[PDB]
């Protein structure tokens, strides 16, 4: 996820579909992004 | 609804082969499965959604003593394990 | 990517949002026993 | 000695589309189109019963 | 600049834009269904009375 | 292949691993259902403040040494050969223990004229809500509800 | 957990009341639904609930 | 009764509940009385108080 | 004591006696003396349950 | 022995605390359920257990 070109292949099931980051925020890195952001490119 | 079928083969392999190994010592860079994600990103260069995360072969399964239950909708596995692997040591059970 | 819903009327415009985070590993290595006496490695 | 750091795979969701007709509510609606709304300015039904 | 750095950069913006435009296309598909319930609750007094 | 300690090191082999939370939500959680045994007992055992040094003593030194052993005659939490300069009080060991680990019954002075309605609830024993849950993130309300 | 999961959604803003009602509904539950297997050993229905 | 320690805690709810699943007590299950926790050992208590 | 329209007493000493005697530590007792323009400014409590 | 095994269903403990809590539960299981068949012969699905 951090390296975005790695996530161009997801290679796994995005499966839970629950409200992310309203949970424990246990992630070492996570970005709550709207439709676009310049750092993606 | 017991005695189901799962994989006995322990789950796959990551090796630092020539895709990794070159990037490993020369730059210090490491990419999980640089083969396809190097290939695919070379081809989309000549014209994320990387759905080749892990779906290759579906390796060999066998049959084990497994206890499944029907909790309403879901098919839920259920096993208790003291006599299995926590038995007779000086390690506490969790 | 959290999708949005087109809300109607005098409401703020919901942008197409994006979420990018990273995680790091831990290590927590395991440990192994020592088991070797003398003269099994040698003979008489 | 060698010393690398690693990006160990990354995983993206696949956000789903919904056709509203592909949902059980649309029996309560009548999905009928009208490409020239913005000039219609009014409407009525005179409902003889 | 005619380099492979450029075409990756060019394709990334479109892989956002297509991912952006698919969001708002699903939005009115969602938002209609959202609006489907609101006028049904402007009416419909509760069961008890 | 670690340090040879005599007749061989005897050859451990450790293995590295590591694990992340591959899931954006509260995956894989938990429950709580049974009560095996109440490890430390429900007990009558009081608190001794003469266990530690904390206070200026009486200046009438004839009085305090009378009250020294008067309190710490035979408490289960009463030391023998009392406090050196640095170190613990070395709470003695009774010859047997039956029910479990011992409790500590600490006491705080209260006026008699409160309600018994308070304490028919899970309430804060200090008499006022104190935890860092109720504050509203205005950077000063934490100690404000406290004192 | 179960009291929180209904509130992951909306509010949690200057509706800080809803943060407080999250709390007052939380602590009542932990007094209530713990050792439930054990609080109910015969209510065959409630365990399956 | 500690002015620092309750004030030392955060208040983001995501990290609050998971510490309750594995907190470190101040007590010891390896001593005849509640000896205050020795600085080298772990306990892994639940502790809602 | 609102600033809407409440005829005060004759004795000016009596009013500032009783108004302050009423408003000591009420949860709706306003903090500062009331402005002409603006709300009655209900003082924010530190915590709530 | 039904508590004796579940004493050994741990790491092991000789720290004099578990030895006490072994005994104080062991005497309760003997004081209460020793002659169970005939103590509860009116029941069923416990003699099963």
**DSSP of A29-40:** SB---BS--GGG
Is beta strand B29-31 parallel, antiparallel or unpaired with respect to D5-7?
parallel
Give CA separation, F48 vs F63, F131, H34, in Å.
18, 27, 13
Q: Of C27, H30, J6, nearest to B86 (Cα)?
A: J6
Distance CA(F50)–CA(G45), nearest Å, equals 55
- Contact residues on chain B for E4, CB-CB shorter than 8 A: 45
Q: With contact defined as beta carbons under 8 Å apart, do F14 and C28 qualify?
A: no
Q: With contact defined as beta carbons under 8 Å apart, do C30 and F17 qualify?
A: yes
Distance CA(G18)–CA(G3), nearest Å, equals 12
Q: What angle do CA F139, I29, F133 make, to 5 degrees?
A: 30
Q: What is the DSSP string of H1-49?
A: --TTHHHHS---HHHHHHHHHSB--S--SSSSS-PPPPSS----B----
The DSSP code for G36 is H
- Cβ neighbour number for residue H13 with a 10 Å cutoff: 21
Residue I10: φ, ψ to 5°: -65, -60
Q: HSE on the CB side for G10, CA within 13 Å?
A: 0
Q: Inspect the interface and report whether the beta carbons of A28 and C23 lie closer than 8 Å.
A: yes
Q: Show the DSSP H helices in B1-94 as ranges.
A: 18-26, 34-43
- Contact residues on chain H for G30, CB-CB shorter than 8 A: 48
Distance CA(J44)–CA(B71), nearest Å, equals 26
SS3 B77: strand
- Cβ neighbour number for residue D10 with a 10 Å cutoff: 26
Q: With contact defined as beta carbons under 8 Å apart, do E27 and D15 qualify?
A: no
Is beta strand B5-6 parallel, antiparallel or unpaired with respect to B62-63?
antiparallel
Q: HSE on the CB side for F94, CA within 13 Å?
A: 15
Q: What residue in G sits closest to I49 (Cα-Cα)?
A: G20
Q: With contact defined as beta carbons under 8 Å apart, do C36 and F22 qualify?
A: no
Q: Inspect the interface and report whether the beta carbons of D20 and E23 lie closer than 8 Å.
A: no
Q: Please return the burial class of F24, using the count of CB atoms within 10 Å of its CB with bins 0-12, 13-18 and 19+.
A: buried
Q: Which residues contact F18 (CB under 8 A, 6 or more apart)?
A: C25, C26, C27, C28
Distance CA(C30)–CA(F12), nearest Å, equals 11
Number of H helices, E strands in chain G: 4, 0
Give CA separation, H8 vs F142, H2, H5, in Å.
10, 10, 5
SS3 F40: strand
Q: What is the DSSP string of C4-43?
A: -----SSSPPPPPB---B----------------SSSSS-
Q: Inspect the interface and report whether the beta carbons of B28 and D5 lie closer than 8 Å.
A: yes
**DSSP element (H, E) containing G4:** helix G2-5
Q: Do chains D and G touch (3 or more CB pairs under 8 A)?
A: no
Distance CA(H37)–CA(H16), nearest Å, equals 22
Those chains having 3 or more beta-carbon pairs within 8 angstroms of chain E are A, B, C, D
Q: Which residues contact B63 (CB under 8 A, 6 or more apart)?
A: B3, B4, B5
Long-range contacts of D24-30 (CB under 8 A, 24+ apart): D25/E33, D25/E36, D28/E36, D28/E40, D29/E36
Q: HSE on the CB side for H25, CA within 13 Å?
A: 14
Q: Which method resolved this structure? A: cryo-EM
The 3-state secondary structure of F94-113, one letter per residue: CCCCCCCECCCECCCCCCCC
Q: Which residues contact D7 (CB under 8 A, 6 or more apart)?
A: A2, A3, A6, B30, B31, B32
Q: Residue B75's Cα: distance from chain center in Å?
A: 20
Distance CA(D35)–CA(D44), nearest Å, equals 18
Distance CA(J4)–CA(J19), nearest Å, equals 11
CA dihedral F108, F114, F118, F123 (to 10 degrees): -30
> Looking at CA atoms only, how far is residue A11 from chain C in angstroms?
16
Distance CA(A36)–CA(A28), nearest Å, equals 22
- Contact residues on chain C for A21, CB-CB shorter than 8 A: 19, 21
Q: Of H45, B56, A21, F33, nearest to G35 (Cα)?
A: F33
Give the one of D7, D9, D13 whose C-beta lies nearest to A14's C-beta: D13
Q: Show the DSSP H helices in chain J as ranges.
A: 4-8, 17-32, 36-39
Distance CA(J32)–CA(F37), nearest Å, equals 15
- Cβ neighbour number for residue F50 with a 10 Å cutoff: 19
Those chains having 3 or more beta-carbon pairs within 8 angstroms of chain C are A, D, E, F
Resolution of this deposited model, Å: 5.4
Q: Does the beta carbon of H32 lie under 8 angstroms from any beta carbon of chain J?
A: yes
Distance CA(B64)–CA(F1), nearest Å, equals 37
Distance CA(A6)–CA(B39), nearest Å, equals 12
Q: Please return the burial class of D49, using the count of CB atoms within 10 Å of its CB with bins 0-12, 13-18 and 19+.
A: exposed
Distance CA(H21)–CA(H44), nearest Å, equals 8
The DSSP code for D4 is -
Q: HSE on the CB side for B17, CA within 13 Å?
A: 6
Q: Does the beta carbon of J24 lie under 8 angstroms from any beta carbon of chain F?
A: yes
Residue in this structure with the two tokens 């913005």, named with its chain if needed: D38
Distance CA(B53)–CA(A7), nearest Å, equals 9
Q: Please return the burial class of A1, using the count of CB atoms within 10 Å of its CB with bins 0-12, 13-18 and 19+.
A: buried
**DSSP element (H, E) containing I13:** helix I12-22
Q: Which residues pair with F105 in a beta bridge?
A: F46
The token duo for F78 is 């009463």
Q: Does the beta carbon of D39 lie under 8 angstroms from any beta carbon of chain E?
A: no
SS3 B70: strand
Q: Which residues pair with D5 in a beta bridge?
A: B29
Q: What is the DSSP string of chain E?
A: --SHHHHHHHHHHHHHHHHHHHHHHHHHHHHHHHHHHHHHHHS---S--
Q: Do chains B and I touch (3 or more CB pairs under 8 A)?
A: no
- Cβ neighbour number for residue I32 with a 10 Å cutoff: 7
Q: Please return the burial class of F104, using the count of CB atoms within 10 Å of its CB with bins 0-12, 13-18 and 19+.
A: middle
Q: Does the beta carbon of G28 lie under 8 angstroms from any beta carbon of chain F?
A: no
Q: Of E8, G19, D10, nearest to A31 (Cα)?
A: D10
**Sign of CA pseudo-dihedral J12, J16, J22, J26:** positive
Q: With contact defined as beta carbons under 8 Å apart, do H28 and A37 qualify?
A: no
Distance CA(A28)–CA(A33), nearest Å, equals 16
The token duo for F117 is 């309605």
Q: Please return the burial class of B23, using the count of CB atoms within 10 Å of its CB with bins 0-12, 13-18 and 19+.
A: middle
**DSSP element (H, E) containing F67:** helix F61-71
B-to-E residue pairs, Cβ atoms closer than 8 angstroms: 9
- State the helix-helix crossing angle for B34-43 and B18-26, rounded to 10 degrees: 90
Distance CA(B48)–CA(D12), nearest Å, equals 6
SS3 B1: coil
Q: With contact defined as beta carbons under 8 Å apart, do F135 and H11 qualify?
A: yes
> Looking at CA atoms only, how far is residue G1 from chain H in angstroms?
8
- Contact residues on chain A for E20, CB-CB shorter than 8 A: 35-36
Q: Of B84, E3, G33, nearest to F32 (Cα)?
A: G33
């Amino acid at each position: 996820g951090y390296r975005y070109a790695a996530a161009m292949v997801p290679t796994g099931s995005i499966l839970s579909t629950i409200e992310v980051a309203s949970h424990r925020r246990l992630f070492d890195f996570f970005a709550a992004v709207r439709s676009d952001e310049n750092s993606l490119y | 609804e017991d005695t189901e079928a799962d994989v006995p083969v322990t789950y796959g392999e990551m090796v630092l082969n020539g895709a990794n190994l070159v990037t490993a010592l020369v730059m210090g860079k490491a990419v999980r499965s640089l083969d396809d994600v190097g290939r695919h990103l070379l081809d989309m260069q000549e014209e994320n959604r990387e759905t080749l995360d892990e779906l290759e072969s579906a390796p060999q399964t066998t049959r084990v003593r497994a206890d499944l239950v029907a909790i309403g909708d879901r098919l839920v596995f259920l096993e208790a394990l003291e006599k299995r692997i926590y038995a007779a040591t000086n390690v506490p059970y969790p | 990517h959290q999708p949005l819903i087109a809300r109607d009327g005098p409401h703020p415009v919901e942008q197409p949002v994006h979420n990018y985070m990273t995680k790091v590993i831990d290590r927590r290595a395991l440990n192994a026993a020592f088991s070797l006496a003398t003269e099994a490695i040698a003979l008489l | 000695d060698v010393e690398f750091d690693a990006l160990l795979g990354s995983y993206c969701n696949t956000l789903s589309l919904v056709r509203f007709l592909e949902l059980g509510l649309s029996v309560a609606c009548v999905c009928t189109k009208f490409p020239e709304l913005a000039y219609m300015n009014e409407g009525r039904v005179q409902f003889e019963v | 600049d005619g380099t492979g750095i450029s075409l990756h950069r060019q394709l990334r913006a479109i892989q956002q834009l297509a991912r952006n435009v698919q969001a708002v296309l699903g939005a009115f598909e969602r938002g209609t269904a959202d609006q489907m319930l609101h006028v049904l609750l402007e009416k419909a007094p509760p069961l008890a009375l | 292949a670690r340090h040879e300690t005599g007749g061989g090191v005897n050859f451990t082999l450790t293995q590295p691993r590591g694990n992340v939370d591959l899931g954006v939500g509260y995956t894989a959680v938990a429950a709580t259902g049974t009560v095996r045994n109440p490890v430390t007992d429900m007990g009558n055992l009081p608190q001794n403040f003469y266990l530690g040094r904390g206070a200026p003593p009486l200046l009438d030194n004839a009085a305090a040494v009378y009250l020294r052993n008067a309190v710490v005659a035979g408490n289960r939490l009463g030391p023998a050969q009392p406090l050196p300069v640095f170190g613990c009080a070395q709470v003695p060991r009774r010859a047997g223990m039956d029910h479990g680990q011992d409790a500590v019954c600490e006491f705080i002075a209260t006026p008699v004229a409160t309600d018994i309605n308070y304490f028919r609830r899970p309430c804060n024993p200090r008499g006022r809500a104190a935890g860092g849950v109720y504050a509203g993130d205005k950077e000063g309300d934490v100690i404000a509800l406290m004192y | 957990l179960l009291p929180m999961q209904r509130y992951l959604d909306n509010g949690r803003l200057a509706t800080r009341v809803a943060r407080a009602t999250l709390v007052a509904e939380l602590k009542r539950s932990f007094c209530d639904t713990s050792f439930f297997l054990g609080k109910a050993g015969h209510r065959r229905e409630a365990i399956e609930a | 009764f500690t002015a620092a320690d309750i004030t030392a805690k955060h208040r983001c709810l995501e990290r609050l509940i998971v510490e309750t699943g594995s907190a470190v007590s101040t007590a010891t299950a390896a001593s005849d009385v509640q000896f205050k926790r020795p600085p080298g050992c772990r306990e892994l208590v639940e502790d809602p108080c």
